[PDB]
Each structure stands twice: as structure tokens, then as C-alpha cells.
Symmetry: C3
Subunit: 507 residues, 3 copies
Amino acid sequence: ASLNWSVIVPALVIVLATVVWGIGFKDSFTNFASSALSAVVDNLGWAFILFGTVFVFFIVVIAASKFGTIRLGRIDEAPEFRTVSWISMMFAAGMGIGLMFYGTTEPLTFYRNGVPGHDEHNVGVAMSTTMFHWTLHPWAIYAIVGLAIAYSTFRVGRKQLLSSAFVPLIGEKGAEGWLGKLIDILAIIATVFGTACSLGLGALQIGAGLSAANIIEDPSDWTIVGIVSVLTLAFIFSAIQYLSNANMVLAALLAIFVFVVGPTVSILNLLPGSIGNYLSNFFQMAGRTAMSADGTAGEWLGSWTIFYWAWWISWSPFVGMFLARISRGRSIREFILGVLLVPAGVSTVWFSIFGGTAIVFEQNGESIWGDGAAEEQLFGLLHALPGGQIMGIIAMILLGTFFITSADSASTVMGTMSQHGQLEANKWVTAAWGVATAAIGLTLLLSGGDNALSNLQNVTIVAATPFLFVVIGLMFALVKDLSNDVIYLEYREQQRFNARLARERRV
Amino acid sequence: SLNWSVIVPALVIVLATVVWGIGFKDSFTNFASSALSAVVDNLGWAFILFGTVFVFFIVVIAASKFGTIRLGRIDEAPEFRTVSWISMMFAAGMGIGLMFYGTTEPLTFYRNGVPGHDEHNVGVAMSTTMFHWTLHPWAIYAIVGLAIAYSTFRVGRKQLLSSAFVPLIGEKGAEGWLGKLIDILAIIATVFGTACSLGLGALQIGAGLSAANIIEDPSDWTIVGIVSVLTLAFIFSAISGVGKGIQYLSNANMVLAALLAIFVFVVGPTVSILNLLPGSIGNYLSNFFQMAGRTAMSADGTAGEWLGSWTIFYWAWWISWSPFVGMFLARISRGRSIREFILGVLLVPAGVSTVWFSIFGGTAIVFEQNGESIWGDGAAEEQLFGLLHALPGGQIMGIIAMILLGTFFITSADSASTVMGTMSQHGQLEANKWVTAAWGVATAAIGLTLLLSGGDNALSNLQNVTIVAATPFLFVVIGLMFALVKDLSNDVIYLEYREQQRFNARLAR
Amino acid sequence: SLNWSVIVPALVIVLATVVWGIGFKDSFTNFASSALSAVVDNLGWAFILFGTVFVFFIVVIAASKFGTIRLGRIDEAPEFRTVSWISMMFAAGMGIGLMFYGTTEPLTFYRNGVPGHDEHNVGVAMSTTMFHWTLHPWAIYAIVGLAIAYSTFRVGRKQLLSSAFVPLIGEKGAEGWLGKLIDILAIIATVFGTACSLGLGALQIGAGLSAANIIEDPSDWTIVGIVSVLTLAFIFSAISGVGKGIQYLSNANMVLAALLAIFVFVVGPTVSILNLLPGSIGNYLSNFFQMAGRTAMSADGTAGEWLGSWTIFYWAWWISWSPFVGMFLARISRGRSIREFILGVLLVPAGVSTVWFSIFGGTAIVFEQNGESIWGDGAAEEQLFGLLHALPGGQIMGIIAMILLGTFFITSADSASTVMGTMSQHGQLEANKWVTAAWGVATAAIGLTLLLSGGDNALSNLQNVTIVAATPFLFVVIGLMFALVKDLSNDVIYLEYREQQRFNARLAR
Ligand SMILES: CCCCCCCCCCCCCCCCCC(=O)OC[C@H](COP(=O)([O-])OCC(O)COP(=O)([O-])OC[C@@H](COC(=O)CCCCCCCCCCCCCCCCC)OC(=O)CCCCCCCCCCCCCCCCC)OC(=O)CCCCCCCCCCCCCCCCC
Ligand SMILES: CCCCCCCCCCCCCCCCCC(=O)O[C@@H](COC(=O)CCCCCCCCCCCCCCC)COP(=O)(O)OC[C@H](O)CO
Ligand SMILES: CCCCCCCCCCCCO[C@@H]1O[C@H](CO)[C@@H](O[C@H]2O[C@H](CO)[C@@H](O)[C@H](O)[C@H]2O)[C@H](O)[C@H]1O
Ligand SMILES: CCCCCCCCCCCCO[C@@H]1O[C@H](CO)[C@@H](O)[C@H](O)[C@H]1O
Ligand SMILES: CCCCCCCCCCCCO[C@@H]1O[C@H](CO)[C@@H](O)[C@H](O)[C@H]1O
Ligand code: NA
Ligand code: NA
Ligand code: NA
């Protein structure tokens, strides 16, 4: 049995090529990234937008059908994790700097400028579209992949790999053929690029925060390299439930502080308004394409919606693998519902607090927009409240933990996929994957410079385009696998044997 | 016998309110206004959010596996015929809200508009009226009635609100201070809700008698006489015990309501009404979750006063009526599945309300459009008769409207006094006559005080007081949601199969 | 064993219509216009309300416990392959409506707008097209087909529309005057709904021939020739009934439709079509109840003309096609679950329609936006050919569209004639050849008289006559809902248990 180097060599060489290209040819690299972004958006925004909603419909249908009763493993099998631990490690493994970066910038921006098909200065629209971007589509994508891997690995006992879940469509040989290796390579590439995007955004935010805190006058690239090296040493020392709990506690502390000291009643007013507007406008936002607003929503979608849909598909491999790991013995209905609704509620509360505070300030006359730097909005908001100077440090500690709870899980899963789904993989390969993620993030940030944000968005969309089709195909693979279950095999066989009525009619 | 520990606090608060209202009608009004402002500003979000959470919760309970549990033993058959059951359900749960706001509400929303929408929009008017009168209120009633029914029949506990919280607080908690507090809150909510209904009924009857020329001056003594008659009835009803007064008056209510609705339908713009019907339902389900999200931050944060006048007042009113309506619903729903109940309570009254508002609001809106407006001086109690006198043969339908105004009240305020006696006698099905009479007189008193104070308005005071009185019971209803979930999850049929999971969880480690 | 009592009433109505249309082309037009106005004004609410009630009803029936029943002997299996089954359902369910309104409808709504919305809105245009062509119509078909299938296979009753009403009127009623009336209404609706399609198809073929410049100028003789050809086919195709011509022609229909769709998709704005697709479904599902609640008094009360032209006409058209399409759907759905037939009928045709309207309406709208408008004179019968001639290699596609029109009509006309034969022969599967030929000739004659009358437009006359003829059958479908619920509830599997619950209720003391 040959070792799985056919999935290691291509990914390494591709990422090294990307690194050298981004270093030595910054202008050419940026031009190529922009051109690829334009092509991908123009030709596959429809695919992203359509299947974003098809995922949510598919997941609800699966949990409301006969398949919901199944359990992940042998019949009447019991779980191994407590419910509270299960959710605490669900939310903290599939989240990063997304909430901290776009907690304030997103609803405030949509309030100020508006969205296609709607006029500016509409709090309901701002909050509804934020909830759209952060509540049910993103976690439906994770639920589909996690459910597929959990079904493939526990009920059927296959190896813990993405290619395994495709066995019904392609067969065991196909799982071990070129197609399975291609799927694994695509998964690894998507993981690396998604995590690089997250690392870059988080580093930018930490740099802006340190600049605001007056520790540093101007954020230097050397500071970013130092931060990444510190993270490298930290995780290397590490190589988790404790860190997940710490993340939840720190996030709760910061949210509670802002809620108590900010406009409490306005936040609590925005809660029901946010949820109601979200479900009023759910399919009007899901049906938004480049042909809306007389064909003027292309740029907005490429900047906001398609970026998010590609971003959350980049993280689907390693988040889905983790969720499959931590969901042994749970029913399908319980997996799907925990995953889709607990993180959705957390995100709702987070965005309500921070977006509501920002919008209330913008209404009162005080402004935290400033120059419009998306990386300094959080710290501007905090410095607009008493005790912000001490909560900045808690925000920085949280930021750090949000990527260390995920990068830990990205590297572990990437090691797993490179060893035929072994529970533990080579430490050296894990270190190499961590270094690769760091290197990709750093080169993207440096190459982008002024346009670092846009460069990250373009690259993640390009890298995540291939895995959209993998996730689409995995829907059919999961359906076929669930249909062909031991419970219903005999019944469907009886119907198939009763298929002689067609022959009788032809007679 | 009688508790004597829930009665005394309740009577003390009622008498304090009465003396405050009569002795100092300016201080009372000022306090009511201040408390209303504070309550709205600090708990409108609670009212608005949980109004919708109730509907979601009850729909999920009906749709889930728990909707098969019968509200009796497993081999149980309903004791009431479906038509009689639903007739009593509607007659107990709807007082004078369809008569008072049948014409006023859609007409007001057409003329003035609604936050976040342009005026003179018939679809919006009808949709928001249906929002206020269809699903959200009967969802509250279904939750409370289901909790009490499950507590009393399937588990056999005492017929009280406290007994439904045994899952959360246990028997020692249901007999301690918390049980007494819940019973006192339930009694107070019932008294204040019924008093608000009594005040609105008295106002409407006075206006009607003015219109019909039976009495020239609607002075205070006329209102006292109206309340005295309205109390003598509804006290003889649950006292003489000469027969099935409750069922006979329920049937009379339904018959008179049908008669008046049919009259207006035939003599009014029939085709316009029938056009409104599908339009009303479509625009409702179109804007159902956009109205559920309307709050004090909507319309660029200027919708507070409108919500205080319309939505929060309604949500408090229906919450305050929840205790005794829920107890009655539990009473007449033995041996009915947890889904037949949750779908005969949600859907039948919602359809009746839809038809009622379609007919009356459509007639009013069509008259407004055609120039024969009936707004007059804007008195909410002078709309219906103003409408009725605008149709041929309507001069003799004022009397039927009054008879109907009365019957609606008598029927529900006889369901309320019976249940209050039951609560005050540790869950005795057949309450004491004297306790029933005392609660009826207390309700009448409170209604009279609320009406007399602030005579210039006489309507804002009712809304302020009912919101303030019903604020505490919102949390009781939410706790009822959790208690009901726990009690359904801990059924014997589910216990016998789920115990193995807990037993084997430790072994599997 | 011909009926001779259902045939004669239908024959005299058809002959009266033909004579009136031909010999008096002014009186017929005036009467049609007057009847259309009256019917719309007094029953638009009925059409609009029950359109959505049908969708809700069929969804509930598929979701409820009745979904598990099989439409055959217990533990029976389907007799037709799923792909062939669905191909036949789509090919018989619809004829020349996607070829006629594929381009005209979305383009018209994009240009002029719809009531309550501003013009030049792509989302609105697509959403309302989808509304007219996706869920409501196939819901009507599902209801009627399910009723007939359950009456015939599950209960072994006769294959008639009167038989499905046995639960409500009893066997003596099924052979009584009411059964005869229902059968006559079914035949009349079938004839007058198929004549509408024949007229539209002939008009479009004439326009296409004019566009191709095969004929110097169209004349009534060309229309008569086209109608005669389309009658010879569909009368020469039902004669044999042994060579399996219907399945082969259905497959040919699907193949040619796919070919034309693929050509337009590849050569037209592919990316814009693909952009519209998810946008279409989203906007449908957003404004699904906003459109369901659109009636004659929406948008300042000027939606009457638009509704009568578009939505009520569509509703009436599909209701008129319901008898024969439902009987055919029942015919080819033996031994399938109720849920599997209701999903197969509702969803696959809805998806095919969505894709069709995307590909064609999207191309038209994109051309409108670019300035290459295909509107021309505005005639609805040549928008498609203008569109095709606006694309490279669109000259052969003219001929392909013509053949597709022909096959479209033939596949449904054959089934209509066969079902009329079964109706006229007491539900015999194999009808007499002469009855089939006579009914085909009657359909052709009605189409011709409708087309000749009102020669200036010839389309408004078709719409008026279709609405008038399909009005009576709306109530037959509404009654079919109740009949179906009664027949499903009283099933053998449930009859053995609900008796216990009924007996226990009576002794509830
Ligand atoms: C004025 C207001 C009017 C409108 C009100 C509408 C709002 C809700 C009203 C209340 C409805 C409660 C329904 C709950 C289920 C009850 C039945 C049950 O136990 O079986 C369910 C079933 C359990 O399986 P089962 O045991 O096989 O069920 C059958 C039983 O065996 C038992 O079988 P049985 O033989 O005893 O038969 C019982 C019978 C009882 O059924 C009924 O009577 C329920 C009727 C519900 C439909 C609407 C109300 C109709 C009222 C009929 C009576 C009219 C009276 C007058 C009132 C109206 C006046 C105008 O049938 C059912 O069991 C009902 C099945 C429900 C199927 C789905 C219904 C939705 C249809 C949607 C059609 C439209 C499609 C396009 C949508 C486009 C969207 C953009 O579970 C499900 O399939 C789901 C149930 C829940 C469905 C509704 C959920 C809400 C709708 C979506 C809301 C939007 C948000 C969605 C996402 C969430 C986040 C936002
Ligand atoms: C989280 C809040 C912020 C929003 C975040 C995004 C999510 C938005 C949606 C939030 C609403 C969730 C509604 C509840 C979900 C279901 C929860 C659940 O577990 O409930 C039961 C799910 O039950 C259901 O059937 C769900 C029904 C949901 C109905 C929709 C909500 C009500 C809508 C009311 C308004 C209607 C009118 C509006 C029309 C426009 C579980 O039953 P079970 O399947 O475990 O039982 C076993 C049995 O075998 C089942 O047959
Ligand atoms: C824009 C306007 C919108 C208007 C919308 C109006 C919607 C109306 C939808 C009505 C749907 C009713 O569909 C419903 O189907 C279920 C299927 O089990 C039937 O269900 C019924 O079956 C039998 C009694 O007959 C019982 O065993 C069962 O408890 C009962 O619920 C109901 O008799 C029928 O009423
Ligand atoms: C404007 C017209 C009305 C539009 C309404 C849009 C509504 C969109 C959002 C749906 C959210 C569904 O959430 C799921 O519900 C399932 C039950 O259905 C649960 O099983 C599941 O757990 C839970 O996540
Ligand atoms: C505008 C604001 C709208 C807010 C909408 C929020 C909607 C919340 C809906 C909660 C529904 C709870 O349902 C129960 O859940 C239990 C736990 O899963 C089940 O055990 C039980 O069976 C079931 O009845
Ligand atoms: Na994390
Ligand atoms: Na009453
Ligand atoms: Na056809």
C-alpha cells in the first residue's frame, strides 16, 4: 500500500508556485487575480447563488424526511460527547475572524450605502442582509459536508476521507482512482487558501488595533511576520476543548460589555426586528443575481455575497471533517439542527449588539466610519465607549484565539487527509501545512498592500470555485448513500421485484 | 376550602387600585401614563419577540411527535361535540373586541396609515388587522390552555396555573411562595383584563344608546346602570344554575354574530367584501414576518407611540385574558389530541376573525372610498352604529348589536369569574357562589374606576392599566412554554424508551 | 353502449355555439364581451381564492398520512417507467402555451409592468410568469387526477368524473341528474378549452408562415387548411390506439422542445439566462402570496382589466383543461403513492416551465435592454419567430418551431378526444372510433368559429369564451376537493380504527 504522496506533491508545488508568483510578480499577480475574479464572478455567480440556497433547502428536506431518524453509527448507539461540549466545539471550530472583522463594518456599511434593490438608511435591510450572510447558508454548507463524512465513516465504516463519501457515485476503484486523489487535492487547496484568507484578515485587524492602542505608530509588515512567528511557535508547542471554552467565555465577556454599556434598549429592539426582516427578505436576497437593479449588482455581489459563499466553501472540508469527528452517535435531525441553529443564534446576537451600536451612533450624529478603514471600525466603536482601552486587549486576545482554535483544526484535518484518513498523522507534515498556510497568507497580504482586502477576496473566490462542484456532487452522493440503507434495502428490493408490472403492461 | 392566602393579596391590590382611581383621578392618571411609557420603552421588545415565538412554538408542538398525545388517558374519547366545543371556545375567548374594533381598526389604518407604509393602502390595512386578530393571540391561548390541560388530565395534577410549573419548581415550589405568586398574578391579570373589556363594552353601549335616541345624555349614571345590568347578568348566569346558561349563551352569541355579519354582507358591497377576502389573506401571509419584526426602531425609530396604542396594547390585553381563557379551554378539551386542540384553537377563530374584519372593515373602507365616510368625530365607539345607520334597515340592527355586545361580555366574563373561583379554591371545579360574586363585583368595580378616571379620554387609561397589569404575566407564559416542553418530553411512553439511553450512556464510556 | 343522454346536451351546446359564431359575428362578440365582464366582476374572487386553496390543499394531502396510500391494489407497483410516465404527464398536460407565451408574457411584463409594481423590473416579470405557469395550474391537474385515480383504482368505481362524487351524492345521485350534469360540464369544458389551444396554435403557425415568407399574405383559407391538417392528425392518431403512437409522439415532443430550448440557450445570452434562473425562483417564492392576493380591487382598483387578460384567463384555461388531463393522469398513474403522484405532477412540470420561461423570456428581456427589441408591431403570435430570426441560424428553427407546435397540439388533442370518448361510453377505456372522430371535429369547428369571429383581434374572443365556458367547472373542482377528502378519510385501512374512536365518543360519560 503506497503512501498518499500523490495528494501531497501537487498541493505543495501549486502553493509554492503561488508564493513565488505573488512575491516576484506582484503587479502581474494582482492583474491575474483581478482577471480571474472577473471571469469567475461573471461565469459562476449564478452557480454560487443558486446552490447557496439549494444547500439550505436540501438540509431542511433531509432532516424533515425519513432519513432524519437515522443515527450516525450502529442502531440505538449512544454518543460520546456532552451536548454543551458538542456545540461549544461546533461554533469555535467553524468560526475565525469573520465575526470580529465584519461585526461592525458590515451592518454599518449597509446602513450607510444601502444594497441593490433598496434605498440607503434602512436598518431592517442592513440587519437582514447581515443575518443572511452569516446565519443559515454558511452553516448549511458545513452541515452538508459534515453529515456526508459522518455517514460515510461511522454507519458504513469507510475511511475518514472526502473521496470516501463519493463511493456510491464513482465506486471504490473511483475512490482510489485519479478522481479521489483530485478531490483530496482540491480539498487541501481550498483549506489552505481559506485559512490563509482568515489569517491575513486577522493579522490586518490586529495590526490596526495595535496602531489604535498607541503601542505602534504605523503597522509594519515586520509586525505581521512577528505575529505569525509567535503563532507558529505557539501551535508547535501545543502539538481543543479548553481553548474552545476560553473563546466562548471571552466572546461572551466582550459582547456583554458592549451590550450593557451601549444602547441596551436599542439592541434589544433590533433583535426581533433583525430576525423578522431576515425571514421577510430571505428569498428576495437569495434570488439576487447580477441581473438585479437593471444589471448593476455584479460588483456588489462579487465584493460581499460571492466572496462569503466562496469563503465558507473554502473552510467546508476541514470544518466538515471536524464536525463528523465530534458527532458520533447523534441522530441526523440533531446534527443538522444543532449545527444550523445554535451558531445562527450566536451570530444573530453578535451582529445585533455590534451592528446596532454602530447604527445607533451613526443615527445620533457620532460617527465611527472615519476614513472608512474596515479594520479600525471595531476599535473606533470601543474607544467611543468607556473602558474601550482595556477591552481592546480582550479583543486582541479573542482574535488570536479565534484563529488558533481553527488553525489547530485546519492543520490536524490536513494531516488526516494525507494519511488515508488516519486519526493521527505525521507531525512534520502538520508543521509543513501550518507553515504553508502562514506563507500563503503573508504573500497575499504583502502583494496586495493597499488592496490587500480585495486581493484576499479575489484569491479565495478563485481557489474555492472548484470545491463548489465537489460540494454539489456530494449532495447526490449523500442522497444515494442514505437511500441505500439496510433499513429500507429489503423494501426497495420488494418494489423492484414488483417491477414486472411494466413487462405485464407491455404484454 | 378557599385559600385565604391568594385571595387577600388580590383583593388588597384591587381595593388599593379602586381607592387610588376614585380618590385621586389625576395622580392615578399620571402614574398610569408614566408606567405605560416606562413599560413600553423597556419591554416592547419582549412583547414583540415573544408574540412571534409563541406562534412558532405552538406550530412546532403541533407538527412534532407530541401532537398525538391525547389530553386524557390513551384510550380516551372527547366529551363534547366538535361544533359545540368550537362554539364555546370562540365564545369564551372573544369578548367585545370584534364589535369595538371591527370597523375602527381597518378604517383607521386606511385613513391614517401604518409605520413604514403609505396611507390609503387597503392591503396593508387588512393585513395588519388580521395580524392583530388572527394567529398571535390564539397562539397565546393555545399555549396556556395546552399547558393546563396536560397538567390536569394526562398527569392528573391540580387544576391551577402553579401546578403546570411542577416540572421546573417541583411540588414544594408549587405550594411555596412561587405558587402563590403565580396564582396571584393570574388572578390580577384576569381581573384587569376583564375590567378593560367591561369598560370598552360600557362605552360602546352608551354610544349606541345615544345613536338610537333611547337616552339623550350619556351621563355617568347611565354608565353605572349599564355596568350594573352587565354584572347582574353574568352573576345570575353562574349562580341560579337554572340550566346550561353557558352553552345556550354561546349558541346565542354565534347566532346573533352570524345574523349581523350576514346583514352587513348582503346589504353592503358584497362583491368588494369578497374581493377583500383573498386580498386580505394574501397580504397577511406576505407581510406576516415584516409586521412581526416591527418595533420601536422601525420607521427610523418613530413607531413607539403607534405600537403602544395598537400592537403592545393588544399583546398585553390577550396575555391578560390568557389565564381564564386557557383554564376554560382546558376544561372543555378532555380527550382531544394535542394537535386537534392546537389546530381547532388556532384556525377556527382566525378564520372567523378574518371573515368578520373582511365584512366590516371592507364596508367601512368602501364607504370611505366612495365618499360616504362614517368617521364623524373619530369616536371609536360611534363607528359601528354610524356604519349600521348608513345601510337600509340598519335602524333596527342597533338593538341587535347591543344585545350582541352584551352577550359577548356576559359569556366571557362568566367564564372568567368561574375560573377565578376555581383558582381561589385550590382548583375546585365547582367554585363557591360567594367567591364568584365577589370576583364579579371586583371586576365591575375596577372597570368603573378605570372608565371614570380621565373621563376626557377614558380609553388611554384602560390601555395603560392593562399593559401595566399584564407585564408580569408575559414571563409566566414564557415559563409555561418551558414547563410544557419538559412535561411533554417526560411522558411515560417516551420515558419507557428514553430511559435506556441514559442508562447505557455511562456504560458506553 | 353509447350514453346518448350526456352526448345530446353537449352536442346542442356545441352546434348552437358554432351557428351563433358563424352566422352572427357581431351578436356573438357582444355576448362574449358582456359575459366576460359579468363573470370577471362577480367571480374573480372565486377564481383567485380557490387558485391558492388548491395549492395548499394538494400540498397538505401529499404531506398528511394519506400520502402513503397507493393508487392501486394494496402492495401494487407502478406500471409505467418513471421517465416515460413523467414525459406523458407533461406532453399531455400542456400544448401550445409555452410556444405562445414563452416570449410574449415576460417581455410584456418587463415593458408595461404589472399592477402594484413599476415597469422595467426583471424580477417582477419573471416572478409573475412563473406564478402563472408553475404551481397553481399543475395543482388543479393534481387534484382532479388524484380524485379520479382514487375513485377508479382504489375503489374499483367507474372511470368517470361523476363517480368521484359518489361520496357526496351516492350511487343513485351518480346516475341521477347531477351525474349527467357533471359529465356534460366536463365534456363542454374539455371542448371549449381544447378549441382555445387549437385557435392559438393555428394563429401562431399562420404568423410563422408569414414570417418565413412562404405565403405572400395570410388568409382565412390558410387558417382553415392548418386547422384541417391539425384535425386529420389527432383523428388519424387516435384511430389506431395499438401502435403506441402516443408514447412515441410524447417522446418526440420532449425531444424537439429540448432541441429548441438548447439552441436558444447556446446561441442567446447564456450567462444572462443562467443569472435569471435563480433570480426567477427567488422572486417567485418572495412574491408568491403577494400575487396570490392580487384581485380586482388592488392598485387603486384598476387591476380588473389586467387580471381578466392574464390571471383569470389562465385560471379558466387550466380549469377547462382539467377534466381530460386529470382523467389521463389517472390513467397512467396506477400503483403509485399519493405523495409520489402529487410531487411528480407538481414539481417536474413546474421545473420544466421555469427553465423554458427563463431561456425565452430572458433572451427577449436582454434584447429589449440592449435595444434589439423584438416587439415589432406587438402581435403576440410572431414574437417567437422574430426572436429566432434575431439569432444566427434561426431559419431552420422556424420550421422546428412549427413542427413543435404541431406535435404539441396533437399529443394533447389525442388524449382529449379519447377521454371524451370514455366519458360518452360510460367510462369504457376503448371508445368507439366514430365518437372520437366526432369530438375532434367538434373541437376543430369551435376553434374555427372562435378564430373567424372578431377577426381584427381574434384573441380576446378566445379568452372571453374560455372564461365563460370554464366558469361552471370551477365549482366542480371545488366540490371535488370535499369529495376527495371524504373518500380518503373513509378508507379501508382507517375505517377499522376510527370506528373505535367514534363509538368511544358517544359513551363519553
Ligand atoms: C388566517 C391565517 C391563515 C393561514 C395560516 C397559516 C399559518 C400556519 C397555520 C397553522 C398550521 C399548522 C400546521 C402544523 C402541522 C399540523 C399537521 C401535522 O401534525 O402534521 C405535520 C407533519 C407531520 O407529519 P405527519 O404525522 O405525516 O402529518 C400528518 C399527521 O399524520 C396528521 O394527519 P391528519 O390526517 O390528522 O391531517 C391533519 C391535517 C391538518 O392540516 C391543516 O389543516 C393545516 C393547514 C395548514 C396550511 C395553512 C392553513 C390552512 C387551514 C385549513 C382550515 C381552514 C379554516 C379557516 C382558517 C383560514 C381562514 C382564512 O394535515 C396535516 O397534518 C397538515 C400537514 C402540513 C403540511 C404543510 C402545510 C403548508 C402548506 C403550504 C402550501 C403553500 C406552498 C407554497 C409556499 C410558498 C412560500 C413562499 O409535518 C410536516 O410536514 C410539517 C408540519 C408543519 C407545516 C407548517 C409549517 C409552517 C409553514 C412555514 C412558515 C414559514 C416559515 C418556514 C420556516 C421556519 C422559519 C421561518
Ligand atoms: C435562531 C433564531 C434566529 C434565526 C436564525 C436562523 C434560523 C431561522 C429559523 C428559526 C425558526 C426555527 C423554528 C423551529 C425549528 C424546529 C425546531 C425543532 O426541533 O422542532 C421540531 C421540528 O418540527 C417541525 O416540524 C418544524 C416545524 C416548523 C414550522 C415553521 C415555523 C412556524 C412558522 C409560523 C408562521 C407561519 C406563517 C408564515 C407564512 C409566511 C423538532 O421535532 P422532531 O422532528 O425532533 O420530532 C420527531 C418527530 O419524528 C417529527 O415528526
Ligand atoms: C391567497 C388566499 C390564500 C387562502 C388559503 C386557504 C388555505 C386552505 C387550505 C385547506 C387545506 C385543508 O386540507 C386538509 O387536508 C387534510 C389531509 O389530511 C384533511 O385532514 C382531515 O382528515 C380527516 C377528516 O377529514 C381527519 O382524520 C383529520 O384529522 C383531518 O385533519 C382536511 O380535511 C383538509 O381540510
Ligand atoms: C415571504 C414569505 C415567507 C418566507 C419564509 C422564509 C423562511 C426562510 C428560512 C427558513 C428557515 C428554516 O429553518 C429550519 O426549519 C426546519 C423546519 O421547517 C427545521 O427542521 C430546521 O432545524 C430549521 O433550521
Ligand atoms: C420576530 C421574531 C421571531 C423569532 C422566532 C424564533 C422561533 C423559535 C422557535 C422555538 C420552537 C421550539 O419548539 C420546541 O423545541 C423543543 C427543543 O428543540 C422541542 O423539543 C419541542 O418539540 C418543540 O416544540
Ligand atoms: Na475558531
Ligand atoms: Na365572549
Ligand atoms: Na400536449
